[PDB]
């Protein structure tokens, strides 16, 4: 919330296991964009905002 929550991002996130995805635009505490996926498993994982598979999964979720 008050610093960059993610240092690294994950490679192959299964879209059939993601419960939700949060998109954090650049803010006064993190100059970058951050994409955090909450699984059904409860666990949280990070995804690159510029990645094509990420932009696709997010786009597929709006439908």
């Amino acid at each position: 919330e008050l610093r960059c929550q993610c240092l690294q991002t994950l490679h192959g996130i299964h879209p059939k296991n993601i419960q939700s995805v949060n998109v954090k635009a650049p803010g006064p505490h993190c100059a970058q964009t951050e994409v955090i996926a909450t699984l059904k498993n409860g666990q949280k994982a990070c995804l690159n905002p510029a990645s094509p598979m990420v932009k696709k999964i997010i786009g597929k979720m709006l439908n």
């Epitope: 008050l2 610093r3 690294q8 993190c30 100059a31 949280k44 990070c46």
Partner: antibody, heavy 126, light 108 residues
Framework: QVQLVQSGAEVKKPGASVKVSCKAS????????IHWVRQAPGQGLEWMGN????????NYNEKFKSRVTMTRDTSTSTVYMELSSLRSEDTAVYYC???????????????????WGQGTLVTVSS | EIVLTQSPATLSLSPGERATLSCRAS??????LHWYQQKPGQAPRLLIY???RSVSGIPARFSGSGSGTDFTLTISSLEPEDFAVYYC?????????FGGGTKVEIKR
């Protein structure tokens, strides 16, 4: 060997620029954030900003934002701190420090800066 | 922004005595408060992380505690090598902020 090795002492003139380097060794470079913290002579510690070794995404203190640029070179496992428009007030010992390890899992319970470089004295004088 | 206030500025004690150091944050920093030691001519050395957790290679005499906004560093029994400057540092939010320092001086 688990180390943070920095570049040597620098004497710069007001208005000029300094580029300090920090070479990571004996550990997973992408697993730790690298911070730049300065100490003015006889003073406390001031955070200037950090960089993510993987992405090269850097975060800066608003006080230094406009004059500072942090970069990384994955091939050498080195990070850089470039301070511009140097003033007398910038005379300090500049340290690089690592915070982690961390991965793709976001956290709310942070580690401390467990490993520091030997520091770089930068003298700003005409 | 966050302001960490260290107290007292100087602490005068003898070897074997117990040292108690204060750090008061301007507002909540959760438990992301860390303790560092600094000797003349050297980089700060991390002692205690996340209010009370232990650090590899750090002797047992060092311990920390804290109640939301107020933090404490305790040195059970002072050794000669413990006389130095101690900083508290927050990394809950950015920018990271450090306190003014506490000098632990030999009493005579």
């Amino acid at each position: 060997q688990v180390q943070l090795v920095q570049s040597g002492a620098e004497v710069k003139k007001p208005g000029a620029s300094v580029k300090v380097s920090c070479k990571a060794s004996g550990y997973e470079f992408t697993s730790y954030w690298i911070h730049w913290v300065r100490q003015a002579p006889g003073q406390g510690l001031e955070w200037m900003g950090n960089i993510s070794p993987n992405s090269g995404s850097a975060n800066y203190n608003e006080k230094f934002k406009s004059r500072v640029t942090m970069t990384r070179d994955t091939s050498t496992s080195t990070v850089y701190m470039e301070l511009s428009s140097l003033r007398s007030e910038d005379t300090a010992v500049y340290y690089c420090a690592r915070e982690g390890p961390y991965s793709y899992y976001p956290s709310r319970e942070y580690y401390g800066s467990d490993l520091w470089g030997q520091g770089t004295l930068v003298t700003v004088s005409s | 922004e966050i302001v960490l206030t260290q107290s007292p500025a100087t602490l005068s004690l003898s070897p074997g005595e117990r040292a108690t150091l204060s750090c008061r944050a301007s507002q909540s920093i959760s438990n992301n408060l860390h303790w560092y030691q600094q000797k003349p001519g050297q980089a700060p050395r991390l002692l205690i992380y996340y209010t009370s957790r232990s650090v590899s290679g750090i002797p047992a005499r060092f311990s920390g505690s804290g109640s939301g906004t107020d933090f404490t560093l305790t040195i059970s029994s002072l050794e000669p090598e413990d006389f130095a400057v101690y900083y508290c540092g927050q990394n809950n939010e950015w920018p990271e902020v450090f306190g003014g320092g506490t000098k632990v001086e030999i009493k005579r």
